[PDB]
Amino acid sequence: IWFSFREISYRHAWIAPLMILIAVYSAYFTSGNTTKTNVLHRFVAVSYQIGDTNAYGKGINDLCFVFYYMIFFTFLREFLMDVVIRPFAIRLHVTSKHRIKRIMEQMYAIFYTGVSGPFGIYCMYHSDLWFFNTKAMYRTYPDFTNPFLFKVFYLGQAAFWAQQACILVLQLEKPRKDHNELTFHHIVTLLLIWSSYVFHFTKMGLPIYITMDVSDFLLSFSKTLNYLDSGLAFFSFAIFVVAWIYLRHYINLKILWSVLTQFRTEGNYVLNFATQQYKCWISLPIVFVLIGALQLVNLYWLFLIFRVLYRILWR
Amino acid sequence: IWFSFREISYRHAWIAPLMILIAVYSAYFTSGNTTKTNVLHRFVAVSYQIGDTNAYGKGINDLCFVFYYMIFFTFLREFLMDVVIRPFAIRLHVTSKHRIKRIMEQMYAIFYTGVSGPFGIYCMYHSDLWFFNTKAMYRTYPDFTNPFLFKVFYLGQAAFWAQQACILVLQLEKPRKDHNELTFHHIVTLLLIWSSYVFHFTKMGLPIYITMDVSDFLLSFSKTLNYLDSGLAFFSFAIFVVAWIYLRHYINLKILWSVLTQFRTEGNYVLNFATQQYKCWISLPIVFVLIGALQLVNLYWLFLIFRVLYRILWR
Amino acid sequence: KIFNLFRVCFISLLLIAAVEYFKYGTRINYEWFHCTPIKEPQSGSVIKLWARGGPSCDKRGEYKTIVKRITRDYEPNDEHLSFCIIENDNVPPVHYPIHEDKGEPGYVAYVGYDTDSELVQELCADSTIYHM
Amino acid sequence: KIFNLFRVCFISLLLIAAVEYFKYGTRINYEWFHCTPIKEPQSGSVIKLWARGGPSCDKRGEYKTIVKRITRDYEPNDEHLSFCIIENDNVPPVHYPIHEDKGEPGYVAYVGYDTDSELVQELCADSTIYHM
Ligand SMILES: CCCCCCCCCCCCCCCCCCCCCCCCCC(=O)SCCNC(=O)CCNC(=O)[C@H](O)C(C)(C)COP(=O)(O)OP(=O)(O)OC[C@H]1O[C@@H](n2cnc3c(N)ncnc32)[C@H](O)[C@@H]1OP(=O)(O)O
Ligand SMILES: CCCCCCCCCCCCCCCCCCCCCCCCCC(=O)SCCNC(=O)CCNC(=O)[C@H](O)C(C)(C)COP(=O)(O)OP(=O)(O)OC[C@H]1O[C@@H](n2cnc3c(N)ncnc32)[C@H](O)[C@@H]1OP(=O)(O)O
């Protein structure tokens, strides 16, 4: 039965992560107690719940949760992509290899973006930051403990991007036109997640997720719908041009100006290392540099997008 | 005049270090004051003299002195070896290239060993450690400040071995039979000098210098006198067999047993990190390991020497 | 040839400095190598600090470890603590037997807070009480 | 392929931990980032310690920097020092104006030795004197 098994599992590449996570899940759920005193609970749930309220703190359990979700997201990817996406793609009749392997990779981006796009907006609805209200991101800066959902969104996405950064290092094969600006993209997504989560500017990180997800969802939607026959996918290009414009540009130009202007005159602006509040005159350069790098790459994608808009329309 | 100059200076290889050290010496001696307030004094003399007595402490000036003597010993080497030794060698009539370049390198070892051999014995004469008296090496262990001469011998030899270790790394060319046991030799000579100087076991380091110098002097004497016509160089082999035997073996077996037995029951044996005295139950393993490594290599050279004794005599 | 030489020259110097920092570093703060802070919690948030070590735990070491514990286990930006440090005078500065029945401690501290400040004030018979 | 992956996974984790140690490390000992120890030498080996900083130099920070200076600038295995730490009570725990005319200090210490112990005893009007 054995080498039939490696061939079987060579084909499919979701089976090993599925086995790992089903074993962990089963062992956690059949042990009876599901309280915080386990070990599987440190890995299969957000730790740190403060008392019996809904505000969770930070620690190393967070790293354990992030790593176990790397394991879970890999399986997802592979399961999904191969099982549903490959099969729907080859129902479709668009049949080839630059076009199908690349429609397939788009196809999984719209899946996850629909899930993350709305999770994030939903998470900022139940809060004080509604429709990117900057006053709120800092009105209470240290934030040593965010909420449940919000902590989960934050580490669910570190779990998701980390793993993708690790998959593009692992060196799959072919980048081509991009991998350079896209690697800038990956590394900066990961430093902002890590930085912001760990220095307590989490309510800064929440708005930017909303912009990236809601714009990238429509981007990948247009790319898939174009990769297939078009019909209207050009209505998805208008829509993505305006989602992208409003969201990434205006959205973040207003958050970046929020950073100069209201990092200063909001919250507590003394360095005070003992209270662990670093909102001062030193961290303002670092924050501005990070979001400025995001805005640079986004206008670089805006030049690609605007070159394509007059190009395509006028050729 | 210029490329004539690089060819000139290519030939000779002492001219650049000579220029450097003559410039430094001249600048130090012509500035008028030669007190400790200069900068050239930090480099061209032992620093740290405690008050106006004769007991000097330790610091970074010591590193500056060691580096400037690297520069001085290089010039010496080259000057000597080329200027006197090469010329006396080619007076000699022994004329070839394994034999002459190797007589030349011996020839400089006997020069310096005669100088260091006696400096070291002289330095232990004016002390409390006469004829390797172990009671004394520890009777007062911390030693944060040794004497003038003794500090100079200590750093004159770090200056000399360091540079030779650096010349054998610099990769001159041909090792062959040795460089392996000889590299063990160099690295351990340097860790003992550095260690012992810096952890205050300097009166431990002084006896071992005496053994190494007085034995190696006779060794290189026999090797030179054999490389030439012999006549009697076999009287220099008896003598070196007995210098080596008494000195390296008995000498250090008694110092190593001094280490188990009298590191414990002499001086202060409490760890006391605040007083900087590390003579405890933890440092005893380290000291024993270091001198045990020296003794291992020395019996390894003793097997080479004893193989040669029955070999040569019986072939 | 030369690269090798410079690379070895920089690891040797790194390690020269790493060991110089062991000496300095363990010397300036030795109160942790020799003194072990023993705390005896009283009724409430009041705990009684002292130290237990070898002859290398002199009164300076006990004072430093008590101060470190007081200022590191209590956060005064929550609420404010109030402590007193009580010296034992019938003791030379170096007094711990190296063995295992140590004896009395050089410095005994009663740290506290402010919700039960009265208890600390009462345990600190007449010594000055320090507020942070 | 895979080596690259594991090597990047270990620098990222090294830097995750390096920054966690910046936070922890600068938090437990902040008395050096915000408080600058100003010492005013009296007649002899007696010097008067205090601290000067922003609003982040609370009474705890002043006490820690005074203690650090007292136990790090004087070696009691030469001879023994004897110091008193004097609190200023007409002061809230957070009192330094962020600007530049600071005001009175929270904690003022007179450290000394033993050859001029009388001077320290006289400058420490009624506060307890601590021997190390
Ligand atoms: C002192 C104290 C110290 C204290 C210190 C304090 C330190 C303090 C530290 C504090 C830190 C503070 C914390 C803050 C940080 C927060 C965390 C951040 C989290 C980040 C998460 C990020 C979000 C998640 C990431 C994601 O989500 S993934 C990354 C996102 N990146 C993208 O998404 C890529 C964008 N890329 C593009 O935009 C494309 O580059 C693109 C080309 C434009 C595409 O355009 P395209 O979309 O290509 O559209 P087309 O489909 O092409 O459609 C149209 C088609 O019409 C076709 N045509 C039709 N007729 C014609 C015709 N007659 N002639 C010629 N062509 C024709 C034509 O063919 C064309 O197409 P064609 O053939 O020309 O290509
Ligand atoms: C918790 C608290 C923490 C606290 C922690 C506390 C930490 C605490 C740390 C505290 C640390 C504590 C501090 C302590 C450390 C102190 C510092 C150390 C400083 C070290 C400085 C070292 C000293 C300086 C170094 C120097 O000075 S340099 C290094 C020394 N190394 C050597 O010197 C190499 C030895 N090597 C050999 O011994 C050769 O290997 C050798 C082959 C035997 C040669 O023997 P050979 O001499 O070869 O003699 P032949 O000339 O050969 O003569 C005889 C010739 O008779 C010839 N023959 C005559 N008739 C015959 C015949 N009828 N048949 C056949 N052959 C015949 C024949 O040919 C033969 O020769 P043949 O042809 O066979 O070769």
Dihedral pair phi/psi, residue B201, rounded to 5°: -105, 60
When scoring A272, A280, A282, A286 by the number of chain D Cβ atoms within 10 A, the one with the most, hence best to mutate, is: A272
Tell me the ligand closest to C22's alpha carbon. Answer: 2
In a domain, residue A185? The reply is yes
In a domain, residue A25? The reply is no
DSSP code, position B49: B
The span from the CA of B185 to the CA of B80, in Å, is 24
Who among B63, B166, B276 is closest to C27 (CB)?
Answer: B276
Q: How far is the CA of C42 from the centre of ligand 1 (A)?
A: 62
Dihedral pair phi/psi, residue C131, rounded to 5°: -105, 135
Residue with the two structure tokens 């920092």: C21
Residues of C with Cβ-Cβ distance to D77 under 8 angstroms: 58
How far from the centroid of its chain's Cα atoms is residue B16's Cα?
24
Cβ contacts of B8 within 8 Å, gap of 6 or more: B15
Interface contact flag, C56 B169, Cβ < 8 Å: no
Interface contact flag, C9 B166, Cβ < 8 Å: yes
Looking at the complex, does the CB of residue D124 fall below 8 Å from at least one CB of chain C? no
How many angstroms separate the CA of residue B200 from the nearest CA in chain C?
12
Beta bridge partners, A49, equal: A56
Query: Residue D81's closest chain C neighbor by CA?
Result: C60
Token pair recorded at residue A207: 């708005």
Which amino acid is located at A232 in the chain? Answer: L
CB-ligand 1 contact for A239 (6 Å cutoff): no
In a domain, residue A237? The reply is yes
Looking at the complex, does the CB of residue C58 fall below 8 Å from at least one CB of chain D? yes
CB-ligand 1 contact for A108 (6 Å cutoff): no
CB-ligand 1 contact for A301 (6 Å cutoff): yes
How many angstroms separate the CA of residue A188 from the nearest CA in chain D?
13
How far from the centroid of its chain's Cα atoms is residue C94's Cα?
16
Cβ contacts of B95 within 8 Å, gap of 6 or more: none
The span from the CA of A14 to the CA of A24, in Å, is 16
Beta bridge partners, B51, equal: none
b/e per residue, B227-263, with b = 16+ CB within 10 A?
beeeeebeebbeebbebbeebbbebbeebbebbeebb
Residue with the two structure tokens 């997640």: A193
Who among C16, C23, C54 is closest to B276 (CB)?
Answer: C23
Q: Strands C107-111, C130-131: parallel, antiparallel or unpaired by DSSP?
A: unpaired
The span from the CA of C21 to the CA of C29, in Å, is 12
Cβ contacts of A260 within 8 Å, gap of 6 or more: A284, A288
Angle D102-D108-D112 (CA atoms, 0-180°, nearest 5)? Answer: 140
Task: Provide Rg for chain D, Cα atoms.
Answer: 21
Question: How does DSSP assign C44-100, residue by residue?
Answer: SS-EEEEEEESTT--HHHHHHHHHHHHHHH--TTTS--EEEEEE--SS-SS---SSS
What dihedral do alpha carbons A285, A289, A290, A291 form, nearest 10°? 100
Residues of C with Cβ-Cβ distance to D131 under 8 angstroms: 59, 87, 93
Q: Assess contact for B178 and B223: CB atoms under 8 A.
A: no
The span from the CA of A68 to the CA of A44, in Å, is 7
Looking at the complex, does the CB of residue C71 fall below 8 Å from at least one CB of chain D? yes
3-state secondary structure string across D103-130: CCCCEEEEECCCCCHHHHHHHCCCCCCE
Looking at the complex, does the CB of residue A30 fall below 8 Å from at least one CB of chain D? no
Who among C87, C127, C130 is closest to D87 (CB)?
Answer: C130
In a domain, residue B22? The reply is no
Sign for the pseudo-dihedral over CA of B194, B200, B206, B212: negative
D33 is in an annotated binding site: no
Angle A272-C130-D88 (CA atoms, 0-180°, nearest 5)? Answer: 75
Cβ contacts of D131 within 8 Å, gap of 6 or more: C59, C87, C93, D80, D81, D82
Q: How far is the CA of A93 from the centre of ligand 2 (A)?
A: 83
CA distance between the termini of chain C: 61
The span from the CA of A153 to the CA of A209, in Å, is 10
Around ligand 2, the residues with Cβ closer than 6 Å are B 185, 189, 192-193, 195-196, 199, 201, 204-205, 208-209, 212-213, 216, 219, 222-223, 226, 237, 278, 282-283, 286-287, 290, 301, 304-305, 308, 312, 315
In a domain, residue A117? The reply is yes
Q: Give the residue among D84, D75, D131 at the shortest CA–CA distance from D110.
A: D84
Q: What strands lie across the sheet with D47-53, from one edge to the other?
A: D35-41, D47-53, D107-111, D82-87, D130-131
**B-C contacts at Cβ under 8 angstroms:** 42
The span from the CA of A72 to the CA of A95, in Å, is 30
Mutate which of A146, A161, A195, A226 for ligand 1 pocket (most atoms within 8 A of beta carbon): A226
A305 is in an annotated binding site: yes
Other beta carbons less than 10 A from residue B79's beta carbon: 17
In a domain, residue B31? The reply is no
Method: cryo-EM
Which amino acid is located at A155 in the chain? Answer: L
In a domain, residue A125? The reply is yes
The span from the CA of A47 to the CA of B75, in Å, is 67
Dihedral pair phi/psi, residue D52, rounded to 5°: -140, 115
What are B118-124's contacts with CB under 8 Å, separation 24+? B119/B153, B119/B156, B120/B153, B120/B206, B120/B209, B120/B210, B120/B213, B121/B210, B121/B214, B123/B149, B123/B150, B123/B153, B123/B206, B124/B206, B124/B207, B124/B210
Q: What is the resolution of this structure in A?
A: 3.1
Q: Give the residue among A75, A52, A49, A53 at the shortest CA–CA distance from A62.
A: A49
Token pair recorded at residue D40: 């005013």
Which amino acid is located at B71 in the chain? Answer: I
Cβ contacts of B140 within 8 Å, gap of 6 or more: B267
**A-D contacts at Cβ under 8 angstroms:** 42
Dihedral pair phi/psi, residue C50, rounded to 5°: -160, -170
B271 is in an annotated binding site: no
Interface contact flag, A274 D30, Cβ < 8 Å: yes
Token pair recorded at residue B58: 């330790």
Q: Assess contact for A251 and A258: CB atoms under 8 A.
A: no
Q: Assess contact for D86 and D108: CB atoms under 8 A.
A: yes
Other beta carbons less than 10 A from residue D8's beta carbon: 14
The span from the CA of B30 to the CA of B35, in Å, is 12
Q: How far is the CA of B231 from the centre of ligand 2 (A)?
A: 23
Domain region containing A158: 46-313
Who among A63, A166, A274 is closest to D27 (CB)?
Answer: A274
In a domain, residue A269? The reply is yes
How far from the centroid of its chain's Cα atoms is residue B314's Cα?
35
**Which 26-45 residues of chain D touch chain C by CB within 8 A?**
28
Cβ contacts of A279 within 8 Å, gap of 6 or more: A138, A141, A142, A263, A267, A268, A269
The span from the CA of A115 to the CA of D61, in Å, is 48
Residues of D with Cβ-Cβ distance to A170 under 8 angstroms: 1-2, 4-5
3-state secondary structure string across chain D: CHHHHHHHHHHHHHHHHHHHHHHHHHHHCCCCCCEEEEEEECCCCCEEEEEEECCCCCHHHHHHHHHHHHHHHCCCCCCCCEEEEEECCCCCCCCCCCCCCCCCCCEEEEECCCCCHHHHHHHCCCCCCEEC
Task: Provide Rg for chain B, Cα atoms.
Answer: 21
Token pair recorded at residue B114: 């005669």
Q: Assess contact for B9 and B15: CB atoms under 8 A.
A: yes
Nearest CA to ligand 1 atom 38: A301
The count of structural domains within chain A is 1
Query: Residue D24's closest chain A neighbor by CA?
Result: A276
Residues of D with Cβ-Cβ distance to C86 under 8 angstroms: none
User: What angle in degrees, to the nearest 10, is found between the helix axes of B61-80 and B15-30?
Assistant: 130
For A50-106, list the strands marked E by DSSP: none
Interface contact flag, B169 C61, Cβ < 8 Å: no
